[PDB]
Amino acid sequence: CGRVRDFVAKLANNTHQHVFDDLRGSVSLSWVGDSTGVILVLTTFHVGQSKLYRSEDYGKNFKDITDLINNTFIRTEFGMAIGPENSGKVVLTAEVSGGSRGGRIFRSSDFAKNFVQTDLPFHPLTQMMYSPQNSDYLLALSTENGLWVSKNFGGKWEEIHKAVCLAKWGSDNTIFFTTYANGSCKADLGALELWRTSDLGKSFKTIGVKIYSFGLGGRFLFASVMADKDTTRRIHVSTDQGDTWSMAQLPSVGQEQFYSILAANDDMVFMHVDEPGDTGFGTIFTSDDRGIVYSKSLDRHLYTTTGGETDFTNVTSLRGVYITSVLSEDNSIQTMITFDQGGRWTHLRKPENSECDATAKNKNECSLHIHASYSISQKLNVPMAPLSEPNAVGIVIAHGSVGDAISVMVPDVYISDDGGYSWTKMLEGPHYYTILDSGGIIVAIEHSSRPINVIKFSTDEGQCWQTYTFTRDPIYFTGLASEPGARSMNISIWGFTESTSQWVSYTIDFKDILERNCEEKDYTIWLAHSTDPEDYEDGCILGYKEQFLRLRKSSMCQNGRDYVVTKQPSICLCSLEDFLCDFGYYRPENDSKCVEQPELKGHDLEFCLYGREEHLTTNGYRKIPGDKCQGGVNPVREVKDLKKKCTSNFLSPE
Ligand SMILES: *[C@@H]1O[C@H](CO)[C@@H](O[C@@H]2O[C@H](CO)[C@@H](O)[C@H](O)[C@H]2NC(C)=O)[C@H](O)[C@H]1NC(C)=O
Ligand SMILES: *[C@@H]1O[C@H](CO)[C@@H](O[C@@H]2O[C@H](CO)[C@@H](O)[C@H](O)[C@H]2NC(C)=O)[C@H](O)[C@H]1NC(C)=O
Ligand SMILES: CC(C)(C)c1cc(C(=O)O)n(Cc2ccccc2)n1
């Protein structure tokens, strides 16, 4: 089959141990900027003392800098507030004496090399929020519920507004916030006012009233608005930062239900709407590019309370792929996969050489099911949720169960190399997995009940493995650490020695395992989303194909830190399949044509009344958001006003 030679040597000298002398309590880990190797470990003990370690070599060596934080006690509730991109900004929130006028923070703007102790004119209630546009601009909520803003990275603060419940950093240093008038935040629930500040407190605009909550998603601003002399509430959307608002074409909810943004981007949002009264499920809706028109995408979508378990996963290694869990009528849980951004959802293909477990009503015919957030929450034997990396094309790794529903059995690990069209059992039993060098290295740690001393690796995308002993003295494993972006060749194995417990981190560099750097010949041409290769339209997802250049499973070379995923789009001809029904239109049975509804019912009728001209004047069809098809079919429809078909039945005044 093929394996790596003299590998023990290549890794032996590349295995860097480091012990953590004083360690117990809340033990945090933080990476500081890309391509820096900066790791910040922070431990807190309760009698009192706080330990702070720093690295500059991808966690191979740490240098105790507890001295830099003037040997004070840090409140892990706030954690290490790290600055965007490579700003190098780090904020630590220290525990102060009960009497104190305000809180105290430690700030570094040089990747934790030098810290500034800074006392504050208030006590923080929230972690400090860095501005996306300006890393030197911060905002925070006082314990007294006041909005404070720093224009100089924590040095100088000023209470820009008082009675606030929630504040968010928008695009280009703009802030949005909910403001209560009466008692508290919990008292004015659905009575709050939504405000905006373009100039950091200098000017304000009340962009909302009778607000339950608000949130940002891609290009949209959503806000649940409470009904007048009514218990219910509904979503309203604003593409212009609160200047104009349109009602969303979504159902309304009572006080016992919630709305959740499952995923949002520049084209659309996946919106979860809770089903009425303690169901433990809801319905997924996909939006239009305006965030106004909504297409029902998935029924009985498993999502617990607002807080807040769902198996909703974006399969980041391949475009338009998402996986989630649905509740079956017999109260069993099934995994569903979408390949066209929730257009159509279906079961996952069962790994060819895998057996149908006890959950299957058929010995030979069934599907793969995935363990995610929910399995974990129900204390199942799941050490890790699915993992996909945008730089490792088509790779998905997850804990599975082959059958008709999610088994409670001890799961094995499964791998897909084509973004979830086809799967194969990667490893037997639970494991901790990580992707390195954009899929050049796959790493695995066994999830055992007893100490471990070995690590497994694959240079052919989990098709062939090679066990290596990182330590003579085994450890009780906790987790892995690798630099966000899956580009390093460095991995930190964490755990503790068998007791008299001492924490350790064995970091391994795979520089000598993958000595040769990849070249043109190591890459092959791969069409994503291929289904029927003899078809002109094969691979068309959202109107276009993407033909990639992918690393050969056989090739055992290094992509490098500077690797660019290379693809080539091919613009397909529009079919009606590239359009979704606009307001008031529907798709009968199997047919792909959009016919007008005989008569609007439910939340559709509500919108037909309480909505605006633009959205109701259709245009039987609308192009799927993010759909880039050209040519072919264009359903050229005269923009017909529908606020006649609703009012048609209602007797109306003069
Ligand atoms: C699902 O994940 C993908 C990949 O992370 C998101 O798309 C990427 O978004 C960035 C935004 O800057 C683009 O630069 C990339 O080109 C996108 N990659 C792909 C694979 O398309 C996507 O938006 C996520 N889905 C949702 C609905 O949020
Ligand atoms: C793994 O960690 C080492 C550090 O232990 C990284 O080494 C850095 O390499 C870049 C060039 O590749 C240099 O500019 C740095 O100065 C190096 N730092 C040190 C301390 O040697 C290495 O890049 C990491 N591996 C990957 C692929 O990210
Ligand atoms: C972000 C946005 C889409 C506007 C939204 C609206 C709702 C809701 O009224 O349920 N939620 C969930 C929620 C519930 C209670 C408190 C905060 C957030 N999120």
Q: Which of 269, 316, 323, 542 to mutate to test the pocket of ligand 1 (most atoms within 8 A of CB)?
A: 316
- Measure the CA–CA gap between 139 and 104, rounded to whole angstroms: 15
Torsion of CA 418, 423, 425, 429, to 10 degrees: 100
Greatest CA separation for the chain: 90
- Cα(356) to centroid of ligand 2, in Å? 46
Residues in the chain: 654
- Measure the CA–CA gap between 110 and 153, rounded to whole angstroms: 12
Does 524 reside within a domain? Answer: yes
Q: Which of 572, 553, 578 is nearest to 442 (CA)?
A: 553
Residue 222 bridge partners (DSSP): 215, 237
Does 559 reside within a domain? Answer: yes
- Measure the CA–CA gap between 422 and 390, rounded to whole angstroms: 18
Return the ligand number nearest the Cα of 492.
2
- Cα(586) to centroid of ligand 1, in Å? 29
Atom 4 of ligand 1, nearest CA residue: 316
Return the ligand number nearest the Cα of 338.
1
Which atom of ligand 2 has the smallest separation from the CA of 483?
28
The two tokens of residue 153 are 């990275």
The two tokens of residue 240 are 């212009």
Q: Domain with 544 in it: what CATH number?
A: 2.10.70.80
| CB-defined site of ligand 3, < 6 Å | 212-215, 222-224, 233, 258-259, 261, 306
Q: Is the peptide bond before 308 cis (omega within 30 degrees of 0)?
A: yes
Does 549 reside within a domain? Answer: yes
- Measure the CA–CA gap between 325 and 376, rounded to whole angstroms: 13
H-run or E-run covering 603: helix 603-610
Bridge-based pairing state of the strands 424-427 and 431-436: unpaired
Q: Which of 599, 641, 608, 637 is nearest to 620 (CA)?
A: 637
Instruction: Find the distance separating the first CA and the last CA of the chain, reported in whole Å.
Output: 83
Buried b (16+ CB within 10 A) or exposed e, 262-280: bbbeebbbbbbbbbeeeee
Residue type, 65: I
The parent domain of residue 547 ranges over 520-571
| CB-defined site of ligand 1, < 6 Å | 263-265, 270, 314, 316, 319, 390
Cβ neighbours for 648, distance < 8 A, ≥ 6 positions apart: none
- Measure the CA–CA gap between 94 and 627, rounded to whole angstroms: 49
Atom 21 of ligand 1, nearest CA residue: 319
- Measure the CA–CA gap between 444 and 298, rounded to whole angstroms: 34
Which atom of ligand 1 has the smallest separation from the CA of 269?
27
Angle at 364 between CA 362 and CA 366, to 5 degrees: 65
| Domain count for the chain | 1
Cβ neighbours for 175, distance < 8 A, ≥ 6 positions apart: 139, 147, 149, 167, 168, 169, 196, 197, 200
Q: What share of the chain is helix, strand, coil (3-state, %, to 5)?
A: 5, 40, 55
H-run or E-run covering 549: strand 544-551
Buried b (16+ CB within 10 A) or exposed e, 341-373: bbbebeebebbeebebeebbeeeeebbbbbbbb
Site of tokens 């002398």: 21
The two tokens of residue 400 are 């599975």
- Cα(357) to centroid of ligand 1, in Å? 35
Does 235 reside within a domain? Answer: no
Alpha-carbon torsion (532, 537, 543, 548), positive or negative: positive
- Residue 126: count other Cβ atoms within 10 Å of its Cβ: 16
Q: Are 646 and 605 in contact (CB under 8 A)?
A: yes
Cβ neighbours for 622, distance < 8 A, ≥ 6 positions apart: 288, 293, 579, 580, 581, 582
- Measure the CA–CA gap between 447 and 406, rounded to whole angstroms: 20
Angle at 342 between CA 338 and CA 348, to 5 degrees: 15
Burial of 519 (0-12, 13-18, 19+ CB in 10 A): exposed
Alpha-carbon torsion (538, 540, 544, 545), positive or negative: negative
The two tokens of residue 104 are 């105290």
- Measure the CA–CA gap between 347 and 324, rounded to whole angstroms: 10
PDB resolution in Å: 2.7
Site of tokens 């090739």: 555
- Measure the CA–CA gap between 351 and 559, rounded to whole angstroms: 29
Q: Are 188 and 180 in contact (CB under 8 A)?
A: yes
- In three-state secondary structure terms, 83 is coil
- Cα(319) to centroid of ligand 1, in Å? 7
Angle at 337 between CA 335 and CA 339, to 5 degrees: 175
Q: Which of 177, 254, 162 is nearest to 208 (CA)?
A: 177
Atom 14 of ligand 3, nearest CA residue: 258
Return the ligand number nearest the Cα of 176.
3
- Cα(542) to centroid of ligand 1, in Å? 14
Residue type, 636: V
- Residue 106: count other Cβ atoms within 10 Å of its Cβ: 22
Does 634 reside within a domain? Answer: no
- Measure the CA–CA gap between 277 and 619, rounded to whole angstroms: 36
The CA distances from residue 119 to 107, 146, 147, 162, 589, in Å, are: 11, 17, 17, 20, 66
H-run or E-run covering 608: helix 603-610
- Measure the CA–CA gap between 113 and 32, rounded to whole angstroms: 11
Residue type, 10: K
Does 124 reside within a domain? Answer: no
Return the ligand number nearest the Cα of 238.
3
Does 534 reside within a domain? Answer: yes
Residue 206 bridge partners (DSSP): 195
- Measure the CA–CA gap between 292 and 55, rounded to whole angstroms: 48
Phi, psi of 445 (to 5 degrees): -120, 130
Residue type, 438: S
- In three-state secondary structure terms, 324 is strand
DSSP H helices in 235-387: 373-377
Bridge-based pairing state of the strands 566-571 and 544-551: antiparallel
Q: Output DSSP code: residue 518.
A: P
Q: Which of 215, 223, 176, 172 is nearest to 197 (CA)?
A: 176
Residue 441 bridge partners (DSSP): 436
Experimental determination technique: X-ray
- In three-state secondary structure terms, 598 is coil
- Measure the CA–CA gap between 467 and 106, rounded to whole angstroms: 43
Does 567 reside within a domain? Answer: yes
The CA distances from residue 624 to 217, 291, 337, in Å, are: 18, 12, 18
Q: Are 411 and 399 in contact (CB under 8 A)?
A: yes
**Extended strands (E) in 109-191:** 116-119, 129-130, 138-141, 146-150, 157-169, 175-179
Task: 602-611: list long-range contacts, CB under 8 Å, 24+ apart.
Answer: 602/251, 603/249, 603/250, 603/251, 603/252, 604/249, 605/646, 606/252, 607/247, 607/249, 607/583, 608/583, 608/584, 608/642, 608/643, 608/645, 608/646, 609/646, 609/647, 610/247, 611/246, 611/247, 611/249, 611/583
- Cα(403) to centroid of ligand 2, in Å? 45
Cβ neighbours for 235, distance < 8 A, ≥ 6 positions apart: 222, 223, 224, 225, 247, 248, 250, 259, 271
The two tokens of residue 360 are 């299957």
Site of tokens 């480091």: 18
